Design a protein around this ligand. Structure first.
Ligand SMILES: [K+]
Lengths: 225, 231, 226
């Protein structure tokens, strides 16, 4: 049982419901605003000093992230996020919340003229707090990478099959944590360095992640670097 | 009674309404999403808070269960290699404030990861999770019953396809083995049987007669009646 | 930056949050009710005079959209939607809202005895307003089509790859805007005319669409009949 301490997460008073609604909206802002490059909308999700971790970015502040994202546009980074289940753990005494947003990362790549997707199921974790004005903001963001897969875009062909089986060979896959191996191979081939100390549902960092989430709910200071 | 022409001709509170109705629909919607967020993550305390103490659940591989028996057989399934996840993909609520009854309609994809002869693959099943909700003595929304419409089914390659893997998977997903099961969850049932689970072949789809049975119970629930999904 | 002017979209007053919740529910009604043929539930999403656009129907009234959707059932149209991220831009001064609902359109097809899905990721845009009873209603609906893919249903086979390559040729795909090419091909083969003038994330109509969205938020009249 990774979450034995229960906070406000179902039912509750109207204020608690509304706070959980507002934090869920904040989290979904990643799927809605980042995919569409609605950058003012996106930046409103975060504290001014917020820190983000991604596969290809590693660690970033929020405008570090915004502009390395905008530069992802021209050298062919095409990433989308299907939101598929969002709920919130809320501590009204500390005004702290954890947003748990399940997503599929779907990234569209091209290898030797063949288009394909990599699809990675995961949990985005948003560490949120009310700022001095009563507005929820995300101070930290990190991802549990759960499972991933290769996805053809066109009808398969034996030609394309054997060209792609070369890049997604085992030897290239195992050098990355089980959970985001296909994503890592594909993004490496695009030329990004991979942050390989990212949490999955198989490795050490799982527990590190949940520990941070628990300390966050209790009102404590954390550091996700 | 239910037709495919219009299965839901009587409208309840499902959009707009009073602030109190909106909040009740929000709370029921959250409860439903608890399945995808909490069950996948084995957050069992959070999960159990979704249900009445006596709640009844149906799945393909478990058949009928209580919430307690379902929790137990679930936690044991992850050592038997069961790796099921749920993508939530559209949840709304029908609310009857006169009976304080609600129906949560939660679209999902069941996505289960399997292995066959060293070949990993997913089965993805699009469906409607139906939560039959009521308010308990503390005024909290709780799911008394849960059951699924299994709509459509597909095999999903995890790695790049290979001819070797193509025809070694063809042996398992033969029409012979597929058509033992209702259209809607055939691939899912073949794969879970290969895992050794007994399949409940009596579950609603969008093509069998249990479709009507399901909608009929949903209607009776909205009207405040007692139902029994063991049938 | 496509959305430079900010309206109510996060936090705000309790009334603003509740209005954004009501608009989000309205948008999700497309995936929950249309898929399940809950037509009376679906109809309550729209103003009486609402207009809708899809690839396979083009411009429709809500009443005519419902009728041709019913007619699609025995023409073999089996369309579903996976909702995958919905937020709302709200202007409380005009009581106007834009519902942005990400989805995957997932449509089941058959070609030469082989079944398959087309999956198309997109943004459903609901142009909503509070009506004179204070109910949120959509007056306009149109879609940004972002990207699509072929999806095998069964275990792949050399024969079925062979057969399907005939339908999803590059010559057949190139007739349609990048964003919904596989979807347009498969729906054309179902017998429908395709509306080739829908917004994508690659064509000029993208800007036309966002222009209308901004004018809608300001309380102005728009017309999406292009
Ligand atoms: K969703």
């Amino acid at each position: 049982e990774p979450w034995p301490q229960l906070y406000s997460h179902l039912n509750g008073t109207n204020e608690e419901v509304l706070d959980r609604m507002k934090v869920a909206e904040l989290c979904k802002g990643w799927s809605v605003y980042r995919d569409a490059s609605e950058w003012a909308n996106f930046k409103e999700m975060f504290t001014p000093d917020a820190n983000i971790w991604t596969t290809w970015s590693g660690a970033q502040t929020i405008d570090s992230f915004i502009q390395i994202s905008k530069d992802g546009k021209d050298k062919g980074a095409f990433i989308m996020h299907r939101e598929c289940g969002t709920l919130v753990d809320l501590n009204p005494k500390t005004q702290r919340a954890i947003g748990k947003m399940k997503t599929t990362i779907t990234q569209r790549f091209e290898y030797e003229g063949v288009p394909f997707d990599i699809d990675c199921d995961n949990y985005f974790i948003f560490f949120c707090l009310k700022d001095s004005n009563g507005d929820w903001k995300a101070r930290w963001y990190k991802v549990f990478y759960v499972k991933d897969k290769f996805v053809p875009v066109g009808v398969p062909t034996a030609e394309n099959m054997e060209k792609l089986a070369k890049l997604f060979s085992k030897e290239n896959l195992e050098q990355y944590p089980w959970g985001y191996q296909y994503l890592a191979v594909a993004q490496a081939n695009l030329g990004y360095p991979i942050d390989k100390k990212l949490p999955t549902w198989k490795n050490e960092l799982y527990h590190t992640m949940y520990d941070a989430m628990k300390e966050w709910m209790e009102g404590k200071e954390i550091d996700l670097h």
